[PDB]
């Protein structure tokens, strides 16, 4: 199916509390495989998944070099941002970068991302054409002009279509039995009396991978998209995910509601009805 | 461990202002300070600093290698662990040295540059500091009646460009630096595209560098050393008003474009 590779980087400045901190994580789909912390002792790109441990030392040296270069770069971009927004040098600020690519079942490129954010707001983003930049505010237009002058979008386009998708295919191959193995959601239902006239029905889904899943409640057929309560798909801690949906039902109409679960690992969507 | 910091800098002139802040237990709580000569002995007769320690006016005795400990009452020992070491160096003691750029302050991106700090005074320690973390250090080498050093800076990136100064210390008072040498600005050229050079009326005078890129400022220089804001033309082109010129962006004065082609 359609797979993805992402890199997320966070640079934070803590005046008086510590040194600037750079944490970087690499994900393929929903499985993290690399991390780099500027506060750990190794100072090297560390593996966080078994299917990537099989790479040679040339790989880790190259990746550690590039991620430490990014560490220094974003550490300085914090200071440059201080002057872009004329901010005090005593406040704490955040700089985030999301980079990556998508491929399809054909193994060919689909979409590439290279975006930045400052203090949680969008900063500069790479358009899907991979040739122009979207600057949110004025400070981002400054960077956009510098970047158009350095011909960076061309280099990024070469990298997004070149090393990025080739590496993504290699990652999907090296852990085929890990990343291309879907796990079905195990489902059950719980019933709790909200009061004498109404109760709450909760349909669970545990131990599913990837984290994509759909839980929908239906009363006599039609959906309750607004009468339902959804929580965020949460990790179990072992590469599987959990989710549940809860709807409040009048006491006696429990037979009129039902929950439908749709997931990639399920050959056919599941219909669950609550019985005493 | 606590975190020890110096505001505004650990390189402070005498009579200036400096402040040691000790962050422990998510607070600038009460702390005790220590020097390297007396590791397990608190300074100032075991003074417990309620607020942060402002060392202004900064004197000579105020320099050295410090570490703090915060108050952890619910622990075996009454205090924390040893914090990160912080070296306060006071400047303005001896005479200023000299700082030269070899081959020049206009460094090409990814290339190297040697900042040579020298003086007739046989300074034993030479220190190089960019105008904002821990400074670099090299021992002075005596030759031809003067002490010199060769600070290598590179490969050139936007983070390594800025105002550099270099200081000298005597053999038995290392934390007391000489006066700051004259500030040397090291600017990086590139990777921004080079502009085009033109000088009405002709080469027989007013600057005029044009480029499609919206450079905020054009800088000009000839073979011998001896700013200029820009504006767009009707062709949207940003023009200005052996010669060479560079393009620069506002708030980024130490990062220039590639050199324009040399013109007669």
């Amino acid at each position: 199916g359609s797979h993805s590779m992402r890199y997320f980087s966070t640079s934070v400045s803590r005046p008086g509390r510590g040194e600037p901190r750079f944490i970087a994580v690499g994900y393929v789909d929903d499985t993290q495989f690399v991390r780099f912390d500027s506060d750990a002792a190794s100072q090297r790109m560390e593996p966080r998944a078994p299917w990537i441990e099989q790479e040679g030392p040339e790989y880790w040296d190259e990746e550690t070099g590039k991620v430490k270069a990014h560490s220094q770069t974003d550490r300085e971009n914090l200071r440059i941002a201080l002057r872009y927004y004329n901010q005090s040098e005593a406040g704490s600020h955040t700089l985030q970068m999301m980079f990556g690519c998508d491929v399809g079942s054909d193994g060919r490129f689909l979409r590439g991302y290279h975006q930045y954010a400052y203090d949680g707001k969008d900063y500069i983003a790479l358009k899907e054409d991979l040739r122009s930049w979207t600057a949110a505010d004025m400070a981002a237009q400054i960077t956009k002009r510098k970047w158009e002058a350095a011909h960076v979008a061309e280099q990024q386009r070469a990298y997004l279509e070149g090393t990025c998708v080739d590496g993504l295919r290699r990652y999907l191959e090296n852990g085929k039995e890990t990343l291309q193995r879907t796990d079905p959601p195990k489902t059950h239902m719980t019933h709790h009396p909200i009061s004498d006239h109404e109760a709450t029905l909760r349909c669970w889904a545990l131990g599913f991978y990837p984290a994509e899943i759909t839980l929908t409640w239906q009363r006599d057929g039609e959906d309750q998209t607004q009468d339902t309560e959804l929580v965020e798909t949460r990790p179990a801690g072992d590469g599987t995910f959990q989710k549940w949906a809860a709807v409040v039902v009048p006491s006696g109409e429990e037979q009129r509601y039902t929950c439908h679960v749709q997931h990639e690992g399920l050959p056919k969507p599941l219909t669950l009805r609550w019985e005493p | 461990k606590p975190f020890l910091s110096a505001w505004p800098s650990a390189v402070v002139p005498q009579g200036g202002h400096v402040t040691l802040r000790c962050h422990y237990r998510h607070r600038f709580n009460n702390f005790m300070l220590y020097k390297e000569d007396r590791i397990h002995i608190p300074i100032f007769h075991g003074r417990i600093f309620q607020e942060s320690f402002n060392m202004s006016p900064v004197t000579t005795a105020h320099a050295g290698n410090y570490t703090c400990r915060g108050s952890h009452p619910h622990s075996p020992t009454g205090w924390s662990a040893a914090s990160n070491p912080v070296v306060i160096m006071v400047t303005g003691n001896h005479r200023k040295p000299s700082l030269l750029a070899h081959p020049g302050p206009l460094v090409k991106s990814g290339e190297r540059v040697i900042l040579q700090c020298w003086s007739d005074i046989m300074f034993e320690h030479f220190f190089l500091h960019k105008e904002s973390k821990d400074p670099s250090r090299l021992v002075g080498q005596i030759h031809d009646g003067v002490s010199k050093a060769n600070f290598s800076i590179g490969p050139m990136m936007f983070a390594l460009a800025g105002t550099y100064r270099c200081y000298g210390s005597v053999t038995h008072t290392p934390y007391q630096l000489s006066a700051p040498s004259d500030p040397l600005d090291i600017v990086v050229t590139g990777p921004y595209e080079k502009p085009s050079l033109s000088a009405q009326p002709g080469p027989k005078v007013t600057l005029s560098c044009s480029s499609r890129s919206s450079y905020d400022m054009y800088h000009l220089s000839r073979e011998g050393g001896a700013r200029l804001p820009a504006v767009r033309k009707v062709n949207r082109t940003f023009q200005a008003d052996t010669y060479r010129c560079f393009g620069s962006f506002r708030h980024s004065p130490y990062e220039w474009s590639d050199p324009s082609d040399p013109l007669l």
Binding site: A24, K66, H70, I80, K146, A150, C164 | F158
Partner: peptide, 8 residues
């Protein structure tokens, strides 16, 4: 593979 990042 980690990208190539540039200064702001």
């Amino acid at each position: 593979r980690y990208p190539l990042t540039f200064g702001w």
